[PDB]
């Protein structure tokens, strides 16, 4: 038998009933009424140093667990501190709820403390951004916003709700507190149409070099239906930064070191929960010169962008993949192309991984960042199980080296399609609190690190067992290198030889500096035994990542990378 | 003139408009402009977080009156500015943010960092545009610069972004017009004599006139304001945004009598000041006896919440001088002002003296007021507070700072927006603007963690700042609201962090203080070795004035409980 | 493929996507596209007011299921569409508006008609963009077309504009991709069997199940809906947007029992229908006994106001069929449905009979119900109402129309938006879509004055419409609220205008009727001579159902007084 209670109590209850067991945030007066109620219900409060980091932690939680996560921030600068992290979640299509404080209704437009247009600022990068002015309707609005965060009436992504403090304190009569709005809801499961399933299976049977490229929507599955389709199709398989870990490394389809060869030669590109954005050359005929196109997703955000499918399936991707696998029951696939790529991939990836253990110092006498990945690979099955480890990468050159150097991980997170520097520490904290049994390892550039370094404090106060490894090359180095190479003028891209280990120790974390690459395995072993911990690696400026070599820093007219841009320029003059 | 890329013409526009430094953080989308600024000899002050670059621009413009410039790359570079842009918008500070953005051919296709920057910033800018016509970029820059001053709006931040393909396009020489490149003077609208006369009539009829200053008054040197105070007999209050205009010894300057002035004035004259929550919305509940007059060069300081019986829209100096002239032959009645001044002398002097001996709290740690006591004791020894730029930031620390900082050439703080983390970026902007003297920033530990890594910026660019941290291991004004009013403290504690160690890790001088008697020495050594941080282990057992008045509770009608109580009584 | 201008490629995209007509009003900014459509043989239906062109597109898409297209020039051409765009957005109707806009070089310089079209339309469109990259225009068109269907949003209007310099730019052939030119099928997401089973379980447990249809059900042919009604024993209500799916004689069809069904159902099943104000917000105050199930192909008809114990997101036909199949072996309990059906037969038959003899009001003029009586009497004589598209518009006239129009192949009206003036533009779109039969639009005089000049469009394009005007010299539902509830009638009277004369002035057949016995003859002659208008001099002494229920008062919680009273009781 419900009673009359304040909006603030109902909001705390809505969240807990929807399966929220933690709220990331930073306290202010505008949200204290909710903050208090969450604590009294036993919801864990993870309080941070910068509200942006709380939204990064929510992001990591939802991406890893599939549970929509929640950040709570006060009016004015509390909300404006979230915009980068909200934009990043919007770009990556991650369900999350930001609850903001805002001034009481009587003072609207009168210059109360922190009256800025939060909803107008956030509308462009949210699925919903509202001020809730009717106490009796707050539960309803919460439940509808939660559904919109999952993608209802839009596509998956962040939502924003704010409740004027006078409304937070208003009582709601029990008759208006409806169980259907309080209760957790299951995810939607739209199913494929059998005609579209049949049509894709026909394209696969007629293709000689089918390739699957996965993304976000595939990563919401466990990968088993994806594997069933790979087996039934003979397709080669590429993942992206947002879809690592779905297919065993030894699978005959898994050809991660043959990215260019797959895109150049596939006659049937099958996207699974994946945008054809700049990360896949806009799906341009310039980059996929032979490919017919099929798109499978539970959101048209991964069906209609840049290329249209000969067939497009809007359905739960696991169901779609299983249905197509079933339709290929009596198909004997032609695997010769996939198998030739897999034979070459085995050698290229094994040679690359082996060479990580002995990469030479640069001309400045400092460690090559590849040695960090070499050291991690050497510790695998000794003091950590990389196969159970959540790996995070962030920075410029460091991030690009990380994409090749991180091959075994239960899960991978990074700067995202948005190129959001500073996610490493907040992501590692969200990851470690989600999965408390194993250290989380975040490898970051020094530039990226300076943005969220003070969250080391959060890791210590909340006991998040993270290991942060900093590639300390005294520079925004991928940028420094573009300046030097293409302008003959390096200016405002140098940083200093800062003591990041000392910063970590100043906030009560374990910290150590490494200048000798032979010390790396030991330093990372000690960091793992004493997490939360930072290893500050003095790295070379004389090292170009693959992203560096390919003009990422230059921003060409048509494509993110020079080679792809050159192919696009040729395509325009046919 | 020759044919040159948009990127060159932008660098030239800035330098010709008097820009000698740009704050920012490099990315590929803005490198073409970045390069051209460096080749022209414009100083690039590169930061650790783009938000801090916009804070630095803000401090430069507020102190110098010269519109300042931040430059950031596409996507997260622009989104990292939103708090600092909002803070400048709230404070009405002219500044230009130049963002990178993707090339035109890739619009809406998911290129790297294609988010709607202009839609995000439109609500908190005077202008937010994407510049797609190479030949018109110069024009757009000049018009945006005028709008940052308040043209077609009110003073505040503007945002311009140039797709990278447009940055690289040549402009023919005939389209590069001198009138858009050249620096422009500020506007100087003059008062109408009938409005001046009508204000002088109101002053002659008033027994207890009071002047409250703000942003617009602070754009003057104070001399015209002092002339009107002399001619009117008015009491004088400033606000956080208008400190240092009137000598402390002036018979009108009654800074410890804020409540008595608002309760009893029969003529409130606002000078370039909003009647926002900082002045009780100008409500009759807070000014129960006051007729109202408003003077400003922007209706943002004329129409908000209370209307003037007279409103003057003019350059405020000219308006103040004209009213002073019109009070030729008036003998002002100063008895109320003088009675407040006598009480003020006692109250302010006893308060400042007590700063040198404030007891430790019950937890055995330093009362933050001892930091202001130590700074007062060093005045005329190792620093001239009268020439010093002082910055305050935090919760309880900020409220204590408002009373403890009484001599400063200039004062900056969290602003009407309550923007925590401004201390370090403001101190850097201030120090590079005025390189002759250390700048002193006093901050809460909570606020400091937001922008602490900008200590690195201060060291790399040799900004002579001294940061003093009130390290009370807490968001303490919030922790205190929780404990007092909910009996539940949760998620407002921090730790006993080594902020001296953080500062030393970034190559700054650093010292920790636990004994209040060590403060003078530590501050002396910090001043001699700037950039420097003093980490003061402070008490949680200390309630600021803001704490005692319910700032943390957020009442229905007013920011503070006493004002809210008065508003509830007015409403029935 | 060859190199061709953007303007040609746009014309080709439209024709390939199945567009055989474009509604609009010519201007210089869109002439390049206008010309190319005509050269390709796409019919141009030019109108008197751009709003009407978008109304015509709306009616075309709602009736045919083919996305329709309006094209308007820059500035006032685009701003004239805003009501019709809002109406399509509220009703969730796919349509494309193509606006002109100024060339890129002149952006922000005050060129002719540079207003922010995309900012004005963003809040009421699924997409609103300015297309600045010639090679990407085709792609943008195809993606916008998909978003109009509901992709990345929900069904509704999209807006695209192309600066005139871009319209004139060539696209190389390699960039003209077949996949963007070609027509696309509608999406067909399928139900999950566990959700289908869980709905069938709820139906088996229910004693008084009721199905209420809307937009999404009306995109089907009704056969799957009738299968579920047969298998479930459910009562059936439609709404204005879902008429004609279930034969009137079906044992479930209880259209005169709306209140009894909502009061007593223990299982409300919405089929492609919002629980907006038209269904009492789905409030427990209006459905006090109902569990809720929601079925739709868009969460716009699943999450609003009430959540389902089950929600099915799927093509509604497939969902209905699957649930019918799952009710294999169920014997439904029809006693409640049958008791409503027996009462419905009497009430609806007595009501329809009474339409032929309704008395004149106290002012001696025709009761508008006689118009529906006359149409009923001509059925099977000079027109087949069962094949006729019927349109209603106005205040009291619209409410009388909801009861008086019982046979129509299809029905359109003012919509949930209450958009007065749709009658004539809807009738024109309907008539050009279905050229074999006259379309009959019944309208208030108030509503008609908004779009009356589109009679000219009907004549110039030979749309066989018959417009019947309820000429009560008033905005009468409003005049009646004023008189009853304020004792002051002011600014709601119109005059005894000659609407027949207006119609004849634009070359249409026209007749005025003052004697109710003349209605059958006048409507016969109008049908034989379409396009035609019948101007009926109607009473002000006639309260519609909407009038009696306080629609005009706007209560706090619900659109109607009785529902509002029930909501107030629920709230205490
Ligand atoms: C513009 C600026 C600088 O101001 C910014 O803001 S940048 C923002 C921060 N940076 C980012 O967010 C990065 C954005 N860029 C990208 O995400 C990528 O450049 C891309 C998605 C556009 C392209 O990535 P790739 O498709 O090239 O994928 P990678 O995983 O990086 O693969 C690189 C190469 O290594 C190869 N490879 C991968 N795993 C390997 C393995 N295990 N062993 C050996 N080789 C391996 C791979 O095949 C490929 O070689 P190739 O076939 O093209 O020759
Ligand atoms: C809501 C939350 C907590 O989540 C937030 O986000 S808060 C954001 C962070 N904080 C802020 O941004 C501050 C916001 N508040 C304010 O700016 C102020 O509370 C106020 C402007 C609204 C009110 O300030 P006052 O008018 O009280 O001004 P102060 O300079 O603080 O003076 C306080 C008292 O000390 C007095 N005083 C000033 N200088 C003195 C002196 N030198 N010696 C002695 N007394 C002195 C002054 O007269 C007054 O006493 P009284 O007259 O009312 O009795
Ligand atoms: C693009 C499209 C078609 O789709 C649209 O939407 S157009 C929208 C509807 N039309 C408009 O709103 C008109 C917009 N255009 C204009 O306003 C004008 O074209 C203009 C302002 C841009 C240019 O006007 P002018 O400066 O040429 O001024 P007018 O008063 O029209 O003068 C025309 C000529 O007559 C002359 N003139 C004026 N008064 C006269 C007099 N009394 N006797 C003799 N000659 C006279 C005048 O000097 C001038 O000749 P000249 O010196 O250029 O040779
Ligand atoms: C918030 C923001 N501002 C700028 C940029 C632009 C950028 C992308 S990569 C990069 C250099 C990163 O340096 P780091 O030290 O982390 O890595 P390394 O190259 O190994 O030295 C910058 C400045 C982005 N994406 N985000
Ligand atoms: C970005 C932002 N997030 C939250 C808040 C809300 C707030 C206002 S005051 C306060 C406490 C500040 O603690 P600090 O340690 O600096 O000061 P002290 O009381 O002396 O211990 C908070 C959290 C604001 N204004 N801005
Ligand atoms: C564009 C617009 N402006 C006002 C209104 C408000 C309204 C709703 S009903 C009504 C009266 C309609 O008078 P009409 O003469 O057509 O009907 P009748 O009652 O039979 O005499 C008005 C003015 C609406 N909905 N739309
Ligand atoms: Mg930030
Ligand atoms: Mg939005
Ligand atoms: Mg670096
Ligand atoms: Mg503190
Ligand atoms: Mg009427």
Residue numbers in the entry:
A (entry chain A): 15 to 588
B (entry chain B), C (entry chain B): 16 to 587
What does the paper say about this structure?
To study the underlying reason for the deviating Km values, we have determined the crystal structures of the enzyme mutants E493Q and E493A in the presence of the substrate 2-HIB-CoA and inactive cofactor dzThDP to 1.76 Å and 1.63 Å resolution, respectively. With rmsd values of about 0.1 Å, the overall structures and the substrate-binding modes are identical in the mutants and the WT enzyme. As expected, the conformation of the Q493 residue of the mutant is almost identical to the one of WT E493 and interacts likewise with Q41. A closer inspection revealed that substrate binding is suboptimal in the WT and the E493Q mutant, since one methyl group of the 2-HIB residue binds very close to the side chain of E493 (2.9 Å). Compared with the WT enzyme, the E493A and E493Q mutants exhibit a 10- and 50-fold reduction of the 2-HIB-CoA cleavage rates, respectively. Accordingly, the 50-fold reduction in the cleavage rate found for the E493Q enzyme mutant can be partially explained by the low acidity of the amide compared with the E493 γ carboxylic group. Hence, the conjugate Q493 amide anion is rarely available to accept a proton from the Cβ hydroxyl group of 2-HIB in step 3. However, in case of glutamate as exclusive acid/base catalyst, typically, a mutation to glutamine would have a more dramatic effect, e.g., a >5000-fold reduction in conversion rates. Therefore, alternative proton transfer routes might be present, possibly, through poorly coordinated water molecules.
Actinobacterial 2-hydroxyacyl-CoA lyase reversibly catalyzes the thiamine diphosphate-dependent cleavage of 2-hydroxyisobutyryl-CoA to formyl-CoA and acetone. pmc2-Hydroxyacyl-CoA lyase (HACL) enzymes belong to the thiamine diphosphate (ThDP)-dependent decarboxylase superfamily and catalyze the reversible cleavage of 2-hydroxyacyl-CoA thioesters to the corresponding carbonyl compound and formyl-CoA. AcHACL is the first published HACL crystal structure and forms a compact tetrameric assembly such as the OXC and ALS proteins. Interestingly, a unique feature of the actinobacterial 2-hydroxyacyl-CoA lyase is a large C-terminal lid domain that, together with active site residues L127 and I492, restricts substrate size to ≤C5 2-hydroxyacyl residues.
